[PDB]
Amino acid sequence: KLIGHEAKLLFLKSFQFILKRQIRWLITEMRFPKEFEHVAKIIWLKILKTINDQPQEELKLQLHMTSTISILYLASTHLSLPVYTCDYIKWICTAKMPYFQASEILPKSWRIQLPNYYVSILEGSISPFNGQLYNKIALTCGMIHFKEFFNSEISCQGLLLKLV
DNA sequence: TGTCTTCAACTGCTTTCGCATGAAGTACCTCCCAACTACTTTTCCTCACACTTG
Numbered sequence: 001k002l003i004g005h006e007a008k009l010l011f012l013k014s015f016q017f018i019l020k021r022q023i024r025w026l027i028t029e030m031r032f033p034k035e036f037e038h039v040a041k042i043i044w045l046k047i048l049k050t051i052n053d054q055p056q057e058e059l060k061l062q063l064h065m066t067s068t069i070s071i072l073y074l075a076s077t078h079l080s081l082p083v084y085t086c087d088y089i090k091w092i093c094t095a096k097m098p099y100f101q102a103s104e105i106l107p108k109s110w111r112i113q114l115p116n117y118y119v120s121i122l123e124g125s126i127s128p129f130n131g132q133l134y135n136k137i138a139l140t141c142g143m144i145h146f147k148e149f150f151n152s153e154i155s156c157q158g159l160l161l162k163l164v
Numbered sequence: 165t166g167t168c169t170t171c172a173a174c175t176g177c178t179t180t181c182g183c184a185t186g187a188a189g190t191a192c193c194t195c196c197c198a199a200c201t202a203c204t205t206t207t208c209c210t211c212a213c214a215c216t217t218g
Contacts, residue, residue: 003206003207007207011207059207059208060208060209061208062207062208062209063209064208064209064210116206116207117206117207117208118206118207118208120207121206121207121208121209125209130211131210131211132209132210132211135210135211136210
C-alpha cells in the first residue's frame with residue numbers, strides 16, 4: 001500500500017524475487033550448475049542497471065508477464081541449453097514456472113503492499129498472443145545489448161532434432 | 165327564624181425483620197451499520213497506420 005517511486009521499488013523487488021524462484025526450479029528442472037544460475041543473475045543485474053538510470057520518476061519498467069521468461073530465455077541461449085516452444089509447452093504443462101500466478105511472492109505482504117498500480121498487475125495476467133512474446137525478447141535484447149554480451153544467440157541443432 | 169335527626173361519601177388503618185432482586189416507562193426518526201452486486205479506478209502494457217521505393 002504505497003504509490004509512486006517506492007511503490008515502484010517493491011514492484012521492482014517482487015519482480016526481482018519471482019524470477020529468482022523461476023530460476024531455481026529451472027536448475028532442478030534441468031540441473032545445469034552454478035552456470036545457469038549466475039548468468040541469469042547478472043542478466044537481470046544488467047537489466048536493473050538500465051532501470052535506475054531513467055529513474056527520477058521513470059515508471060516504464062513495469063516489465064510484463066513475458067519479460068521474465070524472455071530473461072530466462074536469453075540467459076539459456078547464452079548457455080544455449082534448449083529451445084522456446086519446447087520450453088514454453090513444458091512449462092505450461094507442468095506449471096514448471098511460478099509464471100502464471102503471482103501469489104507465491106513470499107509476500108503475503110508484497111501482495112498487500114497494495115498490488116496497486118503494479119504488483120497486483122504481476123504474476124499471471126494472461127497468455128501470449130501473436131508476437132506478444134517474441135517482441136518482448138527483442139526489447140530485452142535492446143535494453144540488454146544482449147548480442148554483444150552473449151555468444152551464439154538462437155542456435156540449437158537441437159530445435160531441428162526436436163522438430164523432426 | 166331557629167334547632168334537631170338521618171344517611172351517605174370520604175379518611176385512615178390492620179406484624180416484624182431480614183434476604184432477595186432487581187426490573188422498568190418509549191415514539192418518531194434516525195444515521196449507522198452490514199450487504200450484494202455492479203460499476204468504476206490507476207498503472208501499466210503492447211501493438212498500429214502511413215509514407216515512400218523501384
